[PDB]
């Protein structure tokens, strides 16, 4: 008979939420990939792509470039990455030169006009230019001849020609500030959730709070530096973080050899979160409440005790402190005993431990010198 802490339980998070600011200040990709012109193949022209959202998911999904192919990166993953600082290089040339847009290569572009480093991590693509950069009088701007080294003549570029002689508007972006967009998601309240605010992962019951952060403050901390609150980066509102509901799961029983039904106690939770009975010690289940009081058989806590009684069940009750007794006092009444009892009563005390000794080398290293 007793109460035993069989397990500890935790409400698992029902959702995961991710929150970041409004997705402003993107890089100007239309100034390179959607430009009205591109430089000669012998003289490729460079621009800068940094201190911005680098929206690489638009390029990875795009079909306008023949292939947005990367020498040392994944094009779908690139929207989650950041480059140290990105250079965007652009040129116009005949489509027969399009195979030169890669590291470890040869020919008038790749070895003499628009060459790239052997270790260059960068993504390159071209849009077909027979409708956009060629001309029927000849595309004379297609001039061709170290890495990025910006004696020469125009390529025979033309719009009616086959795809080798038809030009393409080529460009590439090389590999901090060249950083892709962080994806936001919908917010959740009053449920145990995983969350990830601007750099602040955690798990908890989020709730709209009455605290007053200053305009620059993003996290709230408790006395022991426990993360206590956050500001949402999209609506400038402040949330408490309450930890997800958890506690011990004690099982209450009479002796097994007296009965098999048991009552379970979830410490310090509201019963809604789990017959049922709320107590100041937690939520109690399988026991049933009664208005009577008895000497405390099995302790629950907070003045509640439980026992097995009558058709039998586990009852739970506010414990008796023993029977109450008003003494018949006055300024003139005395009670005197007329007879007595010689009650022999046991007291018991432990007096010695089991006198243990240990061969600490046999315990730590038994049978090995290499261990010793």
């Amino acid at each position: 008979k007793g109460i035993y802490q069989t397990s500890n339980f935790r409400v698992q998070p029902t959702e995961s939420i991710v929150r970041f600011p409004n997705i402003t200040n993107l890089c100007p990709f239309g100034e390179v990939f959607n430009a009205t012109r591109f430089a000669s193949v012998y003289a490729w022209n460079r621009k800068r792509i940094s201190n911005c959202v680098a929206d690489y998911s638009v390029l990875y999904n795009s079909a306008s470039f023949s292939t947005f192919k990367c020498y040392g990166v994944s094009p779908t993953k690139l929207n989650d990455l950041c480059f140290t600082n990105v250079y965007a290089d652009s040129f116009v040339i005949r489509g027969d030169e399009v195979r030169q847009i890669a590291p470890g290569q040869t020919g008038k572009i790749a070895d003499y006009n628009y060459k790239l480093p052997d270790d260059f991590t960068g993504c390159v693509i071209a849009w077909n230019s027979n409708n956009l950069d060629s001309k029927v009088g000849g595309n004379y701007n297609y001039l061709y001849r170290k890495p990025f080294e910006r004696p020469l003549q125009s390529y025979g570029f033309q719009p009616t020609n086959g795809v080798g002689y038809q030009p393409y508007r080529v460009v590439v972006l090389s590999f901090a500030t060249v950083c892709g967009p962080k994806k936001s998601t919908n917010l959740v309240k009053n449920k145990c959730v995983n969350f990830n605010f601007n750099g602040l992962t955690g798990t908890g019951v989020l709730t709209e709070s009455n605290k007053k952060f200053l305009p620059f403050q993003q996290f709230g901390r408790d006395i022991l530096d426990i993360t206590d609150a956050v500001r949402d980066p999209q609506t400038l509102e402040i949330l408490d973080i309450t930890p997800c509901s958890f506690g011990g799961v004690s099982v209450i029983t009479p002796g097994t050899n007296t009965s098999n039904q048991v009552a379970v106690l979830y410490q310090d939770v509201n019963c809604t979160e789990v017959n049922v009975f709320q107590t100041r010690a937690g939520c109690l289940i399988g026991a049933e409440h009664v208005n009577n009081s008895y000497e405390c058989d099995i302790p629950i806590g907070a003045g509640i005790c439980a026992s097995y009684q009558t058709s039998q069940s586990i009852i739970a009750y506010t414990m008796s402190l023993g029977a109450e007794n008003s003494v018949a006092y006055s300024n003139n009444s005395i009670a005197i005993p007329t007879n007595f009892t010689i009650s022999v009563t046991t007291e018991i005390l432990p007096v010695s431990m089991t006198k243990t000794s240990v061969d600490c080398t046999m315990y730590i290293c038994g049978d090995s010198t290499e261990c010793s």
Partner: protein, 211 residues
């Protein structure tokens, strides 16, 4: 010339709210009761960070060049009539620089205090406006500076020049400070733990009251 850094150049260490709590931290701070070099109006180094405290009726101190050569070999920070330019460029100034009477940004009776710090490759600025008149120097009250900007730059900033009647400079030192955040989440008081043995005791008990 010199004058007393009475109790100035506290700033919110981080973007954290803390309420009715005695949080204590080490950072580059203006040490309490130091002497600032006071200028009434001049190359100055940038040893680790700068507390700065010009008071002017018309804010003629408008631009500071922070860098390595101050020349064409690098932050041009410049307030104008309605905007605040910042850029890193190799550029130039004359034998007597003055203003005619890669980034971008937009913004006596008053004292526009600042603190300017570069650390972990990131350069940052904080501010206060100072509502109170005193013609002599920086008052003996208390006031904490809120953040205004950050940039990564990767430049080993050595020294600076400020262009336009007075300005004051005090170099930051690594120190432990203890900070009294009140209910509203604002710093109401601070203790410089290295100042005197009483401050070494307050930073031991956390409490501003020592028994």
């Amino acid at each position: 010339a010199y004058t007393n850094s009475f109790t100035r150049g506290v700033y919110y260490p981080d973007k954290v709210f803390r309420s009715s709590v005695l949080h204590s931290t080490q950072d580059l701070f203006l040490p309490f009761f130091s002497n600032v070099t006071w200028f009434h109006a001049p190359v100055l180094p940038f040893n680790d960070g700068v507390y700065f405290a010009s008071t002017e009726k018309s804010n003629i101190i408008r631009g500071w060049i922070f860098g390595t050569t101050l020349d064409s070999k690098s932050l041009l920070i410049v307030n104008n009539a309605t905007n605040v330019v910042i850029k890193v460029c190799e550029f130039q100034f004359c034998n007597d620089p003055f203003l005619g009477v890669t980034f971008e940004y937009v913004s006596f009776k008053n004292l526009r205090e600042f603190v300017f710090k570069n650390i972990d490759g990131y350069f940052k600025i904080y501010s206060k406006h100072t509502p109170i008149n005193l013609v002599r120097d920086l008052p003996q009250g208390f006031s904490a500076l809120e953040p205004l900007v950050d940039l990564p730059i990767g430049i080993n900033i050595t020294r600076f020049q400020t262009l336009l009647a007075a300005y004051y400079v005090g170099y930051l030192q690594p120190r432990t400070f203890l900070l009294k955040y009140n209910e509203n989440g604002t710093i109401t008081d601070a203790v410089d733990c290295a100042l005197d043995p009483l401050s070494e005791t307050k930073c031991t008990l956390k409490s501003f009251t020592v028994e």
